[PDB]
Every structure is written in structure tokens, then in C-alpha cells.
């Protein structure tokens, strides 16, 4: 489930999320650059010439960072976010799942590959790999008993309890980005208050037509749906769905 | 404590940005606990703080201050001028960030009149890098239509 | 121009390749690029930040009233029976 300690530390160092200032973004580049190679032409240099910035200053720090302690000829993703002050933030990301599958082909393989692609390296546990391995195997397909009957339920129980623990331990930033039906603790409140992006995520959650407001709106719509088509007041959505599926 | 009577008629202007030159400091105390109770108020206060950070000033980051109150009744905005007078713009439902900006700027013009009447000298408004950044979007809109 | 080209001093910054490689890059080096050095960091600067004068406000209100009366007059201009039936059947197909 979790990669080696040295590999995880190395990944945390290379794929970092610097504190974003929160200014009005101009655009987002998703480029593919190798470690030992400096891109200054059509893929990156042309965009930096269109924008007016110097690609050399970016290539210097990129070659200073990704070149050492890296395997040669490894395609790496770079997400660059440009703000209205003509300033850019670039973040490195591991190779795409397509490149990983290509290198693997020249479930064990799929899980070992998906071990390398979490959503945030600050917490390699969340999200659970077994959910994204589904998309990994789906992309692979797009490209081209007595032990099982107990391991299925063992893994089901482990997945369920880990999902519950994640729902309980969701931090303040994740709470503001996506609502949560578990009580909030003062410890997590202080942990989220220490983070600087708290103000940015707060403004984005306060602005309407956001994902947070959409989740709140669909919660309210489900409440109204229960209040309108419920056999009784204290009706749970699970039993309501059972009624729907058994009454058609 | 003034040597002259105060002004009578105020200039009419749709104040879209803040001007922290005649303003000593601002403390915006906001509550980040829950927002389903103040979606309008929290958004208004946060965008007002954002505009105050992006306001017209040499270094507005040194004059603007934000305070998270884990247990607060309603977000407050305290403004202290060069004299030290404390003013509180009331925040109600339906009040927009532009509304708060206009309130604060009207009260700032009144306070600047009070300072000039008392005898305090004030740095006058002139062409600044913020004015150039504003003429940027002025050129943009004049080229649009 | 080749001598005093931009970033031409990088050959002289590092006195040795070993001394250059001794330095370790961090995410702070990436984060420092997002901060403008001369000007102060500001969140947003859009067209809504443009303050309006009294004449501009009166002109904008006049343009809004003109747009209102223009919509009202177009409600009768497009009310020519052909276009009116067109919009009516379009609304019927929308609601159906």
C-alpha cells in the first residue's frame, strides 16, 4: 500500500507544492519535460516568448533540481501556473500512467505502479490506491478460490475502516474544499489555521457556484426530496433508495 | 480641536478600491469556523480584505491585518486613522464588497477632512505605480470598446 | 551584445562545477519566482477596480436605462407574428 521510505522521502522532496500566493491566475501549462533535458523551444520556450518571460531562469532551476539523483530518460510532468503579476509557479509530477504502463509492458504490476501516483505527497495514505488502480487498469485496457473468498472480505473491511478513518481525520483544508459529516476538532482547526492557504480556500468556498456550494446545494436538494417523497420524517436515504429500487 | 469649520459637500465617486494613505491600519477579524451561516457575509468580508490587500498603497501588506477568531459573533472591521480614531463599518446581509469599500472610502474622506481641519498634514494623492497598473486595464477596456 | 547578453553571468556565477553541484535546490527556489520583487504583491487587478466619476456613473445609468427601453422595444419589434409564433413554439418545445 505504501512505497519504500527512501522512495517516499525522495518523492516528497521532488514533487512539492509551494505555498501559492493566491493571485488571479492567467493560465496553466501542463508540459512534459525530461530530467536531464532543458526545454527552451516550441513546447516551453515558445510559450515563455509569447508570455514575455525568460525561459532560461526556469530552465536553470529545473536542471538544478531534477537532474541529480534521477534516472535518465524519464518523462516528467510539470504544471506551471501563471498569475496576473507575470509570475509563474512550476511543480514537478511523476510520469503519466500511460508512460508507466508503456514501461511496464515494454494487478501486482498495476498496484506497484499506482504506488507512485498519489494526490498529495504530504499524506501518501490519502487517497487509497485501490480506488485509483481502477482508473489505472481502465487506461491500460483503453491502451490495449478458498483464499480469494476470504481475502475479498478482509480487503473490504480494511478499505471500509480506512475510508472511515480518513473521513474522520479529514483536515480543515479538505473540510473547506469538500464538506464532511464528522465533528470538527480544535486540533484540526489549529492545524488548518497554521496553513497560509486557509484564506484562499476560504474565499473559494465562500464564492458561490463553487464545488463546496454545489455539494451543499445537492445536500439541500436531497433533504427536500426526502421531505417531499418520504414515507416518514425520520427516513434515511439508504431506506429511501431501497424503497425506490423495490417499488419502481 | 479644529481651527476651521468642516467641509459640507462630499465628492461623488464610485469607490472601487481602497486608499490607505490617510489610514493608519485596518484589523479585519473574521471567523473561519462555519460558513453555511454567513455565506454572503463571509464572502463580502473576504473579498473586501482581498481588495484592501490589492488597494492603492506603497505597501498595503504593512497596514492590512487579518485575524482568525475561532469563536466570533460576526466579522468586524476596525479602521484606525493617523489621528487614531476608531470607526466600524456595519456589515449586514446584502452588503457587497464594493458597498463596504464605498463606506470605508467615504468615512476616510471625512476623516481626512477632519485631520486637515485640525491641522494635521496629509500626503496628497498623486500618480503612483498603482495608477499605472490601473491605466493598464483602462487601456484594455478602451481597446475593447 | 553576446558579451552583455541576458543571463550571460551564469558562466561566472559558479567558480567550479563541484561548488555548483554542492548546492541543493529546494521548493523555496520555485516559490520565490512567484513574488514580484519591485512592486508589492497584490491579489487581483481587474476592470471592476476602476473607480468611476460622477459623470461616468450618470452615463452608465443612462446607458442602462437605454438598454432597458431597448429590450422593451425589441419585445414589440420581434412581436411580428412570424417571429412571435417562432418564439412561442420554441418555448413550447423547451417546456415539453
Amino acid at each position: 500500500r505504501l512505497p519504500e521510505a527512501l522512495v517516499v522521502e525522495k518523492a516528497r522532496d521532488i514533487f512539492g507544492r509551494p505555498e501559492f500566493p493566491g493571485k488571479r491566475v492567467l493560465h496553466n501549462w501542463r508540459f512534459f519535460i525530461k530530467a536531464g533535458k532543458a526545454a527552451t523551444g516550441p513546447p516551453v520556450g515558445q510559450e515563455f516568448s509569447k508570455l514575455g518571460l525568460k525561459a532560461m531562469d526556469f530552465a536553470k532551476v529545473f536542471n538544478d533540481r531534477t537532474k541529480p539523483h534521477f534516472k535518465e530518460d524519464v518523462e516528467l510532468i510539470v504544471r506551471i501556473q501563471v498569475y496576473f503579476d507575470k509570475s509563474y509557479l512550476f511543480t514537478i509530477e511523476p510520469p503519466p500512467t500511460a508512460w508507466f504502463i508503456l514501461r511496464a509492458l515494454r494487478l501486482e504490476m498495476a498496484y506497484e505502479i499506482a504506488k507512485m501516483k498519489p494526490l498529495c505527497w504530504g499524506r501518501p495514505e490519502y487517497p487509497l490506491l485501490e480506488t485509483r488502480v481502477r482508473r489505472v487498469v481502465g487506461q491500460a485496457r483503453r491502451m490495449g478460490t478458498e483464499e480469494c473468498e476470504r481475502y475479498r472480505r478482509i480487503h473490504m473491511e480494511q478499505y471500509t475502516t480506512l475510508r472511515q478513518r480518513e473521513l474522520e481525520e479529514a483536515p480543515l483544508i479538505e473540510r473547506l474544499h469538500r464538506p464532511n459529516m464528522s465533528p470538527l476538532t480544535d486540533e484540526q482547526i489549529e492545524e488548518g489555521l497554521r496553513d497560509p492557504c486557509l484564506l484562499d480556500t476560504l474565499w473559494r468556498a465562500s464564492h458561490p457556484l463553487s464545488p463546496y456550494h454545489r455539494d451543499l446545494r445537492e445536500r439541500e436538494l436531497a433533504r427536500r426530496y426526502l421531505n417531499a417523497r418520504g414515507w416518514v420524517k425520520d427516513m434515511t436515504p439508504e431506506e429511501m433508495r431501497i424503497v425506490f429500487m423495490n417499488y419502481r | 480641536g479644529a481651527k476651521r469649520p468642516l467641509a459640507v459637500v462630499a465628492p461623488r465617486t464610485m469607490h472601487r478600491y481602497l486608499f490607505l494613505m490617510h489610514m493608519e491600519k485596518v484589523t479585519i477579524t473574521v471567523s473561519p469556523l462555519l460558513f453555511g451561516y454567513g455565506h454572503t457575509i463571509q464572502k463580502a468580508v473576504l473579498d473586501f480584505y482581498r481588495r484592501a490587500i490589492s488597494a492603492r498603497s506603497p505597501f498595503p501588506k504593512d497596514k492590512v491585518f487579518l485575524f482568525y477568531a475561532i469563536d466570533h459573533i460576526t466579522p468586524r472591521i476596525e479602521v484606525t486613522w493617523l489621528d487614531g480614531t476608531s470607526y466600524v463599518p456595519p456589515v449586514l446581509e446584502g452588503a457587497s464588497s464594493q458597498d463596504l469599500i464605498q463606506m470605508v472610502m467615504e468615512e476616510a474622506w471625512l476623516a481626512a477632512d477632519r485631520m486637515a481641519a485640525e491641522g494635521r498634514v496629509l500626503n496628497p494623492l498623486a500618480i503612483d505605480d498603482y495608477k499605472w497598473d490601473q491605466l493598464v486595464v483602462f487601456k484594455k477596456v478602451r481597446d475593447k470598446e | 551584445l553576446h558579451a552583455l547578453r541576458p543571463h550571460g553571468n551564469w558562466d561566472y556565477l559558479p567558480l567550479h562545477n563541484n561548488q555548483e553541484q554542492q548546492e541543493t535546490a529546494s521548493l523555496e527556489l520555485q516559490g520565490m519566482k512567484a513574488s514580484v520583487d519591485i512592486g508589492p504583491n497584490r491579489f487581483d487587478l481587474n476592470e471592476k477596480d476602476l473607480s468611476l466619476d460622477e459623470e461616468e456613473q450618470v452615463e452608465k445609468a443612462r446607458l442602462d436605462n437605454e438598454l432597458m427601453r431597448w429590450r422593451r422595444l425589441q419585445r414589440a419589434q420581434g412581436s411580428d407574428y412570424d417571429h412571435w409564433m417562432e418564439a412561442e413554439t420554441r418555448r413550447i418545445q423547451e417546456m415539453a
Binding site: P18, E19, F20, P21, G22, L193, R194, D195, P196, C197, L198, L199 | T29, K61, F65, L66, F67, Y68, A69, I70, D71 | E28, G31, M32, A34, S35, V36, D37, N41
Partner: peptide, 22 residues
């Protein structure tokens, strides 16, 4: 008798370093 028988503040926000350090 039966009932007794059953019975027995203001913290400043942290500006990101990319904005506060310059």
C-alpha cells in the same frame, strides 16, 4: 426517589511566505 435511584480568541492570519517575505 426512583429518579435518584436510577441516577446514582483573536489570532492573526499567516500570510504565505511568497507574499510576506518580499
Amino acid at each position: 426517589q426512583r429518579q435518584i435511584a436510577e441516577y446514582t480568541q483573536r489570532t492573526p492570519a499567516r500570510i504565505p511566505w511568497t507574499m510576506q517575505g518580499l
